[PDB]
DNA sequence: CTATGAGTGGCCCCTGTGGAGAGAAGCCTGTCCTGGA
DNA sequence: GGGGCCACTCATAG
RNA sequence: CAGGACAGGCUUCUCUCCACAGGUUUUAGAGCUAGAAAUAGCAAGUUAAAAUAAGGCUAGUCCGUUAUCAACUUGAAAAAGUGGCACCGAGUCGGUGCU
């Protein structure tokens, strides 16, 4: 008799519950054969348990690190390009300068050349350090002077500029002379008054520079400026111009009464284009007004930058840096004077102690600028003469460094201008610089487009670029080697969907006109109308649909029921009264793309042309695919023969985003084999059948369904891993699902390969059920109908939670891990009971108090970073990992705290003592993650290298993390690492104590009827003696397996101390005790007033000769190996 | 007399921002359709 | 949250 | 009862590519004076170079932290295969009967 049995499953983020029950809600138990070298040949176990595992993580970190690696590599490549350019002339003056540059990081003992890099002689080095305290001094001096300087200084300046070229946000050119806010505001007002003499603006008395440079929001600046302008509004034309000058996006529809919105934003690249067409609409006389607005905006954002006001040079940033340096020097002198004058004792603290947050700590230590201000602020409060210094502190301007985090707002055009000025001044003495000025400018301004991607030769699983040729990609010949249009199309396509019914065809663009026609006819197909004299609703004819679309859909961007009734039935068909069903208020789809094309091209018959279908659809596809404008113009240049410049540029501007859910070949590509119509043709005219898309794809009359069946290529059965990975969700739930399916497979294998009756458990859960059904039921009957021998049940946790709360079967997650198993068991029981109580309740209570539950910790091989990322200074300790091959850690410091890959057991002989005496040993040597490949290649050589000799190969036992060892008195420990252990034993409590603890913990939070609440409170009051029993049992369990003498003593003392506390507080504090006894690593926990630190087992010597256990994924099959007999002499 | 292991307790760990796209999922208003029961 | 490392102290064997 | 397309909104999340600002580490930026030295006073401090997971070959202006993995037999791996049942009890499972 194949016993009828049910399987219950609970899938969480960390756990997978499993349980097997009979037809009688009873859990069978079986005796299992045990392999190994031990004597315990067979053990009886229950068929219930749960699996715990570490939660999975997303791929975000890997992608971030890859991006960082590419950034670093490309920056170094640019530096190498500059060195290559300077290579010819550098050797003619200083051959070893480049060697000195890179070899700088080595100590003086290691350097092949002289220690001073810049000159190689200390005198010139000191002279350089004196004449130019900061690199900004050199930059400004080269910008302003006309003298011929040494090649090395120019090289240094150019390298500094390139390596920190700054951000690329704003396109176009920036005028550095555009910095005066007031003068440009006056010019804008003057131009407005000249062009609007009937409405002049009196800008006198308005401080434009203060308002526009204020650290307020753009709307606040606009409001403040307008409030000072009588008669003007932010909604007015001048208000919109100011908003644009602030960097907002005003709408110019109202001031020119245009039929179309004219929205301008200076950050958008459309400013030139939209300005051009706006002038084409309102007249070209308004060019200088927008020019003045642009100049004012430029002055604004360059005024927020560049604190310097009136100093005249081509390098304002260098002037700002020098000004800050001078202020820092003067303030430092004054501060030293004052501190020495009044508080000499703290002078040492301020200027000598590195560890404190004073000036010495701010400079030579790790104290940040905010920390330094925080430390110095109370001290300055105690002294006098620091009023302006206090103001500067409030301004984040006191003693400011040059390299600060606010530098993130520097446009690259400033560095470009400085480069251009330096090259202009010095190219007369340096012909090769003048010749390669173009190359230097390109290198400074070059940027890889976002749509191109990595420049690989196919050997990267991330690269998609298509090459025109096979030259080495250089910044000067990038455009001549890469098909930018094809690359962009590939970038778009690989992220697009595939059609469900036709997986071999791309889906159409969302705003494709053919798609819009399809949708409109699809909705019109199911529109019914009832007029006077009509007994039943009738479907609209094809000519009726065509007339309706031409009259309303092509003319109105939205058509409503009332509009249709007034415009077509009442006017065209002369039906005065009509009742329309299937559309309530308005029609859903619309011909927006048709309206846009009729607005741009301004030709209706050209759009109405059926033969231009290919050209029109190709134009729509081109507008959807590409976002860069040059590529769009490149593609549109084929169709320019039919359009003027205005139409082409307006077409150049229309972008469309989104995609449809269906393919063109499905709708209008496949023709009916009988009639020749496509789906669109049938929607246009289907006779009295009037079949919609759903009806057409399911009708057996046409061959479209036959093509659907044929086009279903027999996709090779997706592997369970791949099938789950293809689902929608985070990888963690995917891992949980995979482990659950493996658990189900093992449970099936256990029961003698007899299939179960019922499997008890959002679209992801639906996919899980689908996977289970597919793997379990594969039998097809004589009619090719799947014989569902197994029932799949979907139930929500709310039902089982109610089941628990109704029958006092409380769940306390803080006691142990059995709650997952009990929840799975109750899930299965409730599902079977509902779909299919004195006996049942007794059986359930018997099941709950059962002591043996299979709890298994999943064994894993840890991977990830080689070590921590913080780099530590050199120290005399062997635990420091070198950052590179030829860098002694005691000379340079480096990494620390590597992570163990996995542990291995080694039994061999090791020399010990100064006499070099061979000693037979038995210890654990853990492999670091960085060593994993080397060890896997040849363990023998690796073990020989670490002082282990006479290798005993057959004793190598793979010991991953959480490998379980068994010791005396049932005490269990898990191998946390190569040198640390965790708790391995679980505490079991009688169910009555769990119920009492739950009732006490929610004593004041009772959610039930008043009589039930009072009864529960009385029950809590009656059984106070349980607390002593609970404490005694905890002490006994800790004594037997935990060995926590001092911590237990402190716990006992605290319990005796707080024995007078209220019952709720006592229970709440006692609940915190299980952190000492819970599975996993010990953790510190708080008990009333005293905090108890974590007791950490750092000794792996006791388990060297214990019994090792290997366990199946469900823990039913197991093999036991004793370490004592292993490695015997 | 000093090197060597074995525990107690304490302290540490890379951060911030922008631009570009595609998809998915969940909720809501609603209309229509396919399949079986 | 959780494993590594280090200062400190102590017991032990050469 | 399940499934689907559309019209619109809202919200969140995932995945991929291109850039910036730092941080950390070592070296360079003659420390002076009195004192044998311990030490005491004095001066000064803002910056620069290189590296940022060891490295690898398929040598790319590429890849290197996602995912998967109890034990034994076969297989290079993928992958395939390998373990008796019924009854009475329960402090981590125990006992009885058949085979």
């Amino acid at each position: 008799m194949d016993k009828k049995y049910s399987i219950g499953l609970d899938i969480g983020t960390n756990s997978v519950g499993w349980a097997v029950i009979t037809d009688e809600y009873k859990v069978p138990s079986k005796k299992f054969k045990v392999l190994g070298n031990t004597d315990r040949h067979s053990i009886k176990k229950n068929l219930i348990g749960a699996l715990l595992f570490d939660s999975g993580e997303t791929a975000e970190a890997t992608r971030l690190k890859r991006t960082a690696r590419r950034r670093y590599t490309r920056r170094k490549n640019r530096i190498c390009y500059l060195q290559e350019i300077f290579s010819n002339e550098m050797a003619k003056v200083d051959d070893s300068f480049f060697h000195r540059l890179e070899e700088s990081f080595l100590v003086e003992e290691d350097k092949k050349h002289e220690r001073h890099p810049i000159f190689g002689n200390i005198v010139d080095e000191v002279a350089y350090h004196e004449k130019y305290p900061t690199i900004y001094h050199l930059r400004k001096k080269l910008v302003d002077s006309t003298d011929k300087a040494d090649l090395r200084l120019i090289y240094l300046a150019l390298a500094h500029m390139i390596k920190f070229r700054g951000h690329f946000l704003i396109e176009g050119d920036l005028n550095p002379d555009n910095s005066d806010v007031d003068k440009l505001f006056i010019q804008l007002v003057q131009t407005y008054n000249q062009l609007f003499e009937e409405n002049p603006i009196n800008a006198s008395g308005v401080d434009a520079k203060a308002i526009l440079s204020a650290r307020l929001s753009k709307s606040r600046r606009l409001e403040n400026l307008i409030a000072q302008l009588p008669g003007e509004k932010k909604n007015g034309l001048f208000g919109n111009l100011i908003a644009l000058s602030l960097g907002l996006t005003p709408n110019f529809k109202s001031n020119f009464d245009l039929a179309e919105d004219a929205k301008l934003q200076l950050s958008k690249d459309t400013y030139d284009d939209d300005l051009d067409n706006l002038l084409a609409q309102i007249g070209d006389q308004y060019a200088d007004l927008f020019l003045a607005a642009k100049n004012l905006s430029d002055a604004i954002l360059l005024s927020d930058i560049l604190r310097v006001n009136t100093e005249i040079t081509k390098a304002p940033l260098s002037a700002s840096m020098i000004k800050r340096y001078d202020e820092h020097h003067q303030d430092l002198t004054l501060l030293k004077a004052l501190v020495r004058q009044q508080l000499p004792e703290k002078y040492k603290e301020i200027f000598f102690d590195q560890s404190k947050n004073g000036y010495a700590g701010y400079i030579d230590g790790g104290a940040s600028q905010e920390e330094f201000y925080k430390f110095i602020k109370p001290i300055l409060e105690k002294m006098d003469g620091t009023e302006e210094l206090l103001v500067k502190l409030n301004r984040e301007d006191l003693l400011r460094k040059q390299r600060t985090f606010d530098n993130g707002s520097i446009p690259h055009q400033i560095h470009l201008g400085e480069l251009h000025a330096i090259l202009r001044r010095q190219e007369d003495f340096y012909p090769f610089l003048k010749d390669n000025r173009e190359k230097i400018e390109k290198i400074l301004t070059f940027r890889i487009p976002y749509y191109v991607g990595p420049l690989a030769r196919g050997n990267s699983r991330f690269a998609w670029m298509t090459r025109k040729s096979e030259e080495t990609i250089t910044p000067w010949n990038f455009e001549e080697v890469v098909d930018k249009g094809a690359s962009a199309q590939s970038f778009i396509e690989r992220m697009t969907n595939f059609d469900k019914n036709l997986p071999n065809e791309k889906v159409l663009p969302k705003h494709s006109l053919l798609y819009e026609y399809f949708t409109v006819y699809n909705e019109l197909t199911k529109v019914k109308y009832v007029t006077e004299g009509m007994r039943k609703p009738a479907f609209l004819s094809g000519e009726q649909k065509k007339a309706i679309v031409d009259l309303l859909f092509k003319t109105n961007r939205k058509v409503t029921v009332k509009q249709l009734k007034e415009d077509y039935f009442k006017k065209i068909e002369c039906f005065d009264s009509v009742e329309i069903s299937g559309v309530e208020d308005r029609f859903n789809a619309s011909l927006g793309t048709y309206h846009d094309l009729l607005k741009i091209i301004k030709d209706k018959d050209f759009l109405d042309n059926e033969e231009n279908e290919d050209i029109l659809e190709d134009i729509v596809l081109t507008l959807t695919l590409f976002e860069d404008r040059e590529m769009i113009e490149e593609r549109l240049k084929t169709y320019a023969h039919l359009f003027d410049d205005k139409v082409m540029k307006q077409l150049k501007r229309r972008r469309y985003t989104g995609w449809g859910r269906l393919s063109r070949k499905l709708i209008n590509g496949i023709r009916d084999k009988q009639s020749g119509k496509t789906i669109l043709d049938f929607l246009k005219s289907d006779g009295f059948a009037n079949r919609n898309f759903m009806q057409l794809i399911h009708d057996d009359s046409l061959t479209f369904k036959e093509d659907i069946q044929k086009a279903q290529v027999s996709g090779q059965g997706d592997s369970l891993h791949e099938h789950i990975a293809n689902l929608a969700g985070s990888p963690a739930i995917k891992k949980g699902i995979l482990q659950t399916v493996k658990v189900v497979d093992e449970l099936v294998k256990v029961m003698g390969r007899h299939k179960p009756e019922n499997i008890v458990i959002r679209q992801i859960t639906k996919h899980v059920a689908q996977i289970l059904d597919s793997r379990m039921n594969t039998k097809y009957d004589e009619n090719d109908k799947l014989i569902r021998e197994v029932k799949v049940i979907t139930l929500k946790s709310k039902l089982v939670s109610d089941f628990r709360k109704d029958f006092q079967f409380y769940k306390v997650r803080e006691i142990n891990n059995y709650h997952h198993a009990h929840d799975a068991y109750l899930n299965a029981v409730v599902g079977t009971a509902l779909i299919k109580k004195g006996r049942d309740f007794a059986t359930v209570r018997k099941v709950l108090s059962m002591p043996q539950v299979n709890i298994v910790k999943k064994t894993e091989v840890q991977t990830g970073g080689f070590s921590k990322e913080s780099i530590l200074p050199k120290r005399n300790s062997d635990k420091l990992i070198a950052r590179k091959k030829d860098w002694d850690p005691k000379k340079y410091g480096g990494f620390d705290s590597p992570t163990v890959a996995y542990s291995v057991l080694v039994v061999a002989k090791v020399e010990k003592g100064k006499s070099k005496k061979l000693k037979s040993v038995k210890e654990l040597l853990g492999i670091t993650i960085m060593e994993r490949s080397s060890f896997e290649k040849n363990p023998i050589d690796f073990l020989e290298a670490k002082g282990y000799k006479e290798v005993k190969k057959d004793l190598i036992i793979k010991l991953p993390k959480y490998s379980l060892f068994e010791l005396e008195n049932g005490r269990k420990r898990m191998l946390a690492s190569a040198g640390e252990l965790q708790k391995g034993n679980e505490l079991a409590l009688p169910s009555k104590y769990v119920n009492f603890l739950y009732l006490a913990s929610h004593y004041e939070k009772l959610k039930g009827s008043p009589e039930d609440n009072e009864q529960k409170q009385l029950f809590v009051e009656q059984h106070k003696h349980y607390l002593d029993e609970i404490i005694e049992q905890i002490s006994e369990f800790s004594k037997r397996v935990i060995l926590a003498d001092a911590n237990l003593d402190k716990v006992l003392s605290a319990y005796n101390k707080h024995r007078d506390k209220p019952i709720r507080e006592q229970a709440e504090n006692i609940i915190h005790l299980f952190t000492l006894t819970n599975l996993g690593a010990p953790a510190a926990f708080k008990y009333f007033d005293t905090t108890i630190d974590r007791k950490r087992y750092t000794s792996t010597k006791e388990v060297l000769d214990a019994t090792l256990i290997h366990q199946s994924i469900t823990g039913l099959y197991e093999t036991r190996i004793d370490l004592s007999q292993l490695g015997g002499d």
Side-chain angles (χ1 to χ4, degrees), chain A residues 618-636:
Chain A
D618 187 62
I619 289 167
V620 176
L621 180 64
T622 295
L623 296 178
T624 307
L625 283 174
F626 304 102
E627 192 177 3
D628 190 333
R629 298 189 198 166
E630 293 182 346
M631 292 192 296
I632 293 168
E633 183 170 32
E634 195 176 21
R635 269 199 174 195
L636 293 182

Side-chain angles (χ1 to χ4, degrees), chain A residues 805-822:
Chain A
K805 287 176 180 180
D806 287 3
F807 306 117
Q808 309 185 2
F809 299 126
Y810 304 119
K811 167 178 177 175
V812 183
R813 296 182 178 187
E814 295 72 11
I815 296 175
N816 60 29
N817 296 284
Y818 287 12
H819 66 268
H820 295 299
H822 292 167

Side-chain angles (χ1 to χ4, degrees), chain A residues 671-930:
Chain A
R671 295 178 180 263
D672 171 62
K673 285 179 182 169
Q674 183 178 2
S675 65
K677 292 185 176 186
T678 67
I679 288 176
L680 185 61
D681 298 322
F682 280 112
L683 291 174
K684 287 175 179 178
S685 183
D686 195 28
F688 292 105
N690 203 42
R691 293 167 290 191
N692 75 354
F693 175 68
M694 285 297 296
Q695 289 175 301
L696 291 169
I697 67 173
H698 293 310
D699 197 321
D700 294 315
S701 70
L702 302 180
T703 60
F704 295 128
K705 187 179 178 183
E706 279 190 344
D707 287 337
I708 291 166
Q709 275 181 342
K710 282 175 181 164
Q712 297 302 320
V713 186
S714 54
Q716 282 181 349
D718 281 339
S719 69
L720 175 67
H721 186 240
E722 286 161 325
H723 190 250
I724 293 169
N726 292 340
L727 297 178
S730 80
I733 200 65
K734 292 181 186 192
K735 187 175 182 179
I737 295 161
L738 180 63
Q739 299 318 298
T740 299
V741 178
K742 290 179 178 186
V743 166
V744 173
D745 287 342
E746 190 164 289
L747 288 176
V748 172
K749 189 180 180 183
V750 166
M751 295 301 289
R753 307 181 177 180
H754 298 292
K755 294 178 180 178
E757 279 189 323
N758 308 285
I759 302 177
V760 188
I761 297 169
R762 294 179 291 167
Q763 284 294 355
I764 190 64
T765 311
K766 294 187 176 188
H767 290 145
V768 179
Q770 285 174 345
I771 288 163
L772 293 176
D773 190 71
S774 58
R775 287 180 75 77
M776 295 298 133
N777 299 320
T778 58
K779 294 181 188 162
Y780 293 87
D781 70 6
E782 302 177 6
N783 296 312
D784 274 334
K785 286 189 174 190
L786 189 77
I787 304 173
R788 285 197 179 112
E789 294 180 348
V790 183
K791 295 181 181 183
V792 186
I793 306 161
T794 58
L795 291 183
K796 278 190 175 173
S797 57
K798 181 170 170 64
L799 288 166
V800 175
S801 178
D802 294 348
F803 185 90
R804 277 180 169 278
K805 287 176 180 180
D806 287 3
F807 306 117
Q808 309 185 2
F809 299 126
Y810 304 119
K811 167 178 177 175
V812 183
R813 296 182 178 187
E814 295 72 11
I815 296 175
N816 60 29
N817 296 284
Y818 287 12
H819 66 268
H820 295 299
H822 292 167
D823 287 343
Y825 170 70
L826 292 176
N827 290 338
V829 171
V830 172
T832 54
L834 293 174
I835 290 183
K836 284 186 176 202
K837 293 168 188 165
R839 189 182 109 179
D840 296 338
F841 281 122
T843 301
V844 173
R845 286 179 196 170
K846 186 176 182 176
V847 171
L848 295 180
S849 72
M850 287 180 178
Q852 195 281 314
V853 180
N854 304 280
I855 306 303
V856 180
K857 185 72 177 182
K858 182 175 177 285
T859 55
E860 295 190 340
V861 177
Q862 302 299 283
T863 63
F866 296 155
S867 64
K868 289 183 180 177
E869 298 185 0
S870 301
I871 304 169
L872 299 176
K874 66 182 183 178
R875 293 178 292 173
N876 287 348
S877 178
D878 306 315
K879 297 190 178 187
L880 290 178
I881 304 164
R883 294 193 295 151
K884 292 294 182 181
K885 191 183 177 190
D886 315 310
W887 290 1
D888 179 2
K890 295 180 180 176
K891 297 183 178 185
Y892 302 114
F895 303 116
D896 193 4
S897 309
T899 307
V900 177
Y902 56 86
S903 305
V904 294
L905 181 69
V906 183
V907 183
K909 295 182 185 162
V910 175
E911 288 179 10
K912 258 183 177 173
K914 286 186 177 181
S915 57
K916 296 189 173 191
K917 282 187 177 184
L918 278 154
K919 244 184 178 183
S920 303
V921 295
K922 177 182 178 185
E923 65 183 11
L924 296 182
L925 181 67
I927 307 304
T928 69
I929 296 172
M930 191 173 68

